């Protein structure tokens, strides 16, 4: 027989009882399914981060090897 | 087969349209909507009187057949045979479905228990709102008594409740009667079948010019 197949009464009273449950706000998120390198490049820049204080100044002195960079403003 | 309309008096559904494959439907003879001197111009019939409704009534089309043949057969008796223009302002463009018991011959043996529930088409109906005129009689101002009394005998064939406007219109125009004349008197309105023309100005020149030609020369 036929009384009540497929209703929605009590369905958002239930879904609002142990309530509606926003997901999350995660600082870091999974990189699962990203562009696969991209991520091998960032896995190569993550290793080579070596200078905190030392070489990070030094290459400006190497900029002055061409007395700076007058020319490469174009490309 | 000719189903009564005690069972079909309301706007019970969002209205059935008329498809383009269901031929086998009954052909009515509600083909007539204007009656009287339909060819006379606006200058011949300046009085206009409507039969305005008072509910969101759904009218049958049986009632609208009677409402025109009633008002014809006083106005061909008490108005002169051409001195009017009965016009139905209201067309019966809907379908009613009648699942009747045509369950004789007694041995099909499955006919319907509740299998299946297709509807069966046996006519039309015409839906009405409040303040929606059903007929309008365009005539001359002399028969004003003869027309407002003609429409009383059109009330008693319609269900519901009707109210009888005499218009400030000049016949079947959109214009007020005095406001008709002021716009008419120089060039600005033009005759037609039963209606007028509305500010022929823009554009560009010759329509202003040639309509100024013939009113001058």
């Amino acid at each position: 027989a036929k009384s009540k197949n497929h209703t929605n009464h009590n369905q958002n009273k239930k879904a609002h009882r142990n309530g509606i449950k926003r997901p999350l706000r995660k600082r870091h998120e999974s990189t699962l399914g990203m562009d696969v390198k991209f991520l091998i490049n960032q896995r190569y820049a993550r290793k080579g981060n070596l200078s905190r204080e030392e070489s990070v100044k030094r290459y400006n002195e190497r900029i002055a090897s061409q007395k700076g960079k007058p020319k490469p403003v174009t490309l | 087969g000719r189903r009564p309309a005690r069972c079909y008096r309301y706007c019970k559904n969002k209205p059935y349209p008329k498809s383009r494959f269901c031929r086998g439907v009954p052909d009515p003879k509600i083909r007539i909507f204007d009656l009287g001197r339909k060819k006379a111009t606006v200058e011949d019939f300046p009085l206009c009187v409507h039969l305005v409704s008072d509910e969101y009534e759904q009218l049958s089309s049986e009632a609208l057949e009677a409402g025109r043949i009633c008002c014809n057969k006083y106005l061909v008796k008490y108005c002169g045979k051409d001195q009017f223009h009965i016009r139905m302002r209201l067309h019966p463009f809907h379908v009613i479905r009648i699942n009747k018991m045509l369950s004789c011959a007694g041995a099909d043996r499955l006919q319907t228990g509740m299998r299946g529930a297709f509807g069966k088409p046996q006519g039309t109906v015409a839906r009405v709102r409040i303040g929606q005129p059903i007929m309008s009689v365009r005539s001359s101002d002399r028969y004003k008594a003869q027309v407002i009394e003609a429409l009383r005998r059109a009330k008693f064939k319609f269900p519901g409740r009707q109210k009888i406007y005499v218009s400030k219109k000049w016949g079947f125009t959109k214009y007020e009667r005095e406001r008709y004349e002021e716009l008419r008197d120089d060039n600005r309105l033009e005759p037609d079948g039963c209606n007028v023309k509305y500010r022929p100005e823009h554009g560009p020149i010759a329509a202003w010019e040639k309509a100024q030609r013939d009113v001058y020369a």
């Binding site: 609002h16 509606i20 449950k21 926003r22 999350l24 990203m34 | -």
Partner: protein, 158 residues
């Protein structure tokens, strides 16, 4: 007795507008899209290469993976009722730029600057928004045509 399947009831989600048919204007391919940017989804009905499904048109979310010519957006889809975080790839013409941050990012400038001009005068900041207060007490002169001006009905006779 159904919907099912995948593009049903899209006679108006992916209908084109009135007379905006035709070649997609070529700025759509020229926009720059970054990772963590926020983005809307209006499934463009003239591009069949990876439309969003109909449950994501209308919905905004954050990009987090950009590719050659599509973008992987994170859209919140409510199920019953536990709101999920989906991970949708769509192309570019099924995406627009949000504006919902754009006002705020000009509010971050000015609250940096309304404190910057008040960096020198010192006092006082008054940074945060207010909703609409009551107006004040005025007084208004006629001054200009004293009263009445007096509307009084007569509304039926018709």
């Amino acid at each position: 007795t159904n919907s099912k399947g995948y593009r049903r009831g899209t006679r108006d989600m992916f209908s084109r507008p009135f007379r905006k048919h035709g070649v997609i204007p070529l700025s759509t391919y020229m926009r720059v899209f970054k990772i963590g940017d926020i983005v809307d989804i209006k499934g463009h009905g003239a591009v069949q290469k990876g439309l969003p499904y109909k449950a994501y048109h209308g919905k905004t979310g954050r990009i987090f993976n950009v590719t050659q010519h599509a973008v992987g957006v994170i859209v919140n889809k409510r199920v019953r009722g536990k709101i999920l975080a989906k991970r949708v790839n769509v192309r570019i013409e099924h995406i627009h730029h949000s504006k919902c941050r754009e006002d705020f990012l000009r509010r971050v400038k000015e609250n940096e600057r309304l404190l910057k001009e008040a960096k020198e005068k010192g006092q006082w900041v008054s940074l945060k928004r207010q909703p609409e207060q009551p107006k004040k007490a005025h007084f208004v002169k006629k001054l200009e045509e004293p009263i009445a001006l007096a509307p009084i009905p007569y509304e039926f006779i018709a």
